[PDB]
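Objective 1.3, modelling of assemblies. Example input:
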Amino acid sequence: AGVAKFAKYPLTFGPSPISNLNRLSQHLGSKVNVYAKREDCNSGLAFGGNTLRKLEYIVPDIVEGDYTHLVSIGGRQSNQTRMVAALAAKLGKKCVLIQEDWVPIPEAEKDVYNRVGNIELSRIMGADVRVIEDGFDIGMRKSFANALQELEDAGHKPYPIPAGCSEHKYGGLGFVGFADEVINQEVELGIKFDKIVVCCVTGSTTAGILAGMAQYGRQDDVIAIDASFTSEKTKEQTLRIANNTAKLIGVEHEFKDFTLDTRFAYPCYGVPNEGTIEAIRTCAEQEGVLTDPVYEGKSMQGLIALIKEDYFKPGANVLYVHLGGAPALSAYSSFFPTKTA
Amino acid sequence: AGVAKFAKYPLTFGPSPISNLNRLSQHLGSKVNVYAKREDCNSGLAFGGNTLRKLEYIVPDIVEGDYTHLVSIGGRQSNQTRMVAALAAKLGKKCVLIQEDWVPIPEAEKDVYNRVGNIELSRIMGADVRVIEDGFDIGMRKSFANALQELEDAGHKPYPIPAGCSEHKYGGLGFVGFADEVINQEVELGIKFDKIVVCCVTGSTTAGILAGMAQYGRQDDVIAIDASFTSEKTKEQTLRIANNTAKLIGVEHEFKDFTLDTRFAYPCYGVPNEGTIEAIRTCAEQEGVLTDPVYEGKSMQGLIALIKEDYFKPGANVLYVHLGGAPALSAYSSFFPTKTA
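Predicted structure (tokens):
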């Protein structure tokens, strides 16, 4: 073990809080005690979110080096870029964001979907936003490198930050510390977590949560919930990222597979489903917590679908991982007609 | 310690953290040291906010006696309501919200202003939205008292959550507690704050801050930046909310006036100006901190103007109170166009 052997540039108020979605439990029979470690309440850096936790271990490199621009990439309502921007504005450096089409822009949204919610926030922070209608892919793209090549020509020194950083050397270190906080937090509250559920589409987040947890032989507590409807390259990458991190944080326990409940991905990436929404509402109507039609929401149903089928024991304490992404919610206004009388 | 005599219902993570906006300070020419007490990061309740803290002293009554529905009132982008919703969710009750027409909806945003940010959210939390056509006013409304009876006709016992909770018998207590934190935090920071800047509209926030700061004879340290564009009522009400509260807490001192710089409210509640849009940008580009075109962008530009005109003692410590509001930002995307590099 050893995440401590890596330089960390704070970007968060510290240990992310864990919410007790208790009142939401009783609506689910009160079978399993639900808890949510709010990552969506990271910092003041434009709403926060998991990307920050990952970034904290990347900034050092950037800053220590004499760079000029921070270039990332992702979908339209990409939650990440919006946090790469905020990071850029804080490190006081230029930012170039590459947003491609990774979701069939619902017609009843075709207008606002590309200039409202997250992408907007990236512009307000003065980033060099750039739209491109390219397909969805949780792997390196052929527009990112080009953009990179672009600045390297203008006489600048850009810093690469792949989608979700999932393909960034220290993309996992971030959640390795995620684990550590969990362990420490179980002792403060006096509550152990039998299982921890969190979304996944590029890896890093969960992967690090694995190796981090792996530190305590608890990888098993983990319960990913595919949200990219491409379970293939996802369980693959999320699992590959997981081992790499281990090498770094000094973990031997190799990884072969992980609980990747892939029954809630449909339809594709970005488009939710009749259930997705029903959960988003319940969690909302019950707790007050907001989720989104691309991530947190889809896993919030998977979280509830399971609680139904008694996948857990009675009195079981499960820890849900809210990675934020609610700012995108505004680009899916249609999917939520007003409460029926 | 008059704010302790009043019971508080745990609605927020804990004492609101203070961001050291050092990079923005350097930008505004090492005049002062700007700090921001982040109330826009005080909960897991739909992006948190300021109203919440106020509610923590009112929710106690919602539970004690028997109340069926939670009814409030605000504008098509009111946060007060987008938070009362979640509170209604968590407190397990019904949500009736009256959204009066308080802002001349820009011709561009008119096809969105009523179905994004604050509003969309409020709905998702299964709220009973009511887009009424009444106009702006920080005083007790008709559509309001109407529904109170309206519901009390359908046979219920709803709870009166007025505009910003300002009118509410306890509206002030919330921020009287705020002050308490400021002093404690100054201690832990090893520094003293010279002035406190904070947007003002209905008046309960500033009134609380005033009432509480008075506990230490620092009521003058308060600097309210109006955003209603109507001094009289706003000052003549805040100045009222200020006293009533000053008595609940036991603070003798009476407020016959307070610093309410009404230089940026232009042109009207809801709509911004090049100055507002300009501040937001500056701050967002300097700290990754997001501010809204209605309450925090204006209180921010004010904070900026005041620094140009050397309004603060050299090397002063100014605490910029960030009460949230960024959620509505998605309904003002027009005002924020992509920037050139």
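Residues 66-167 of chain B form a domain with the Rossmann fold fold (CATH 3.40.50.1100).
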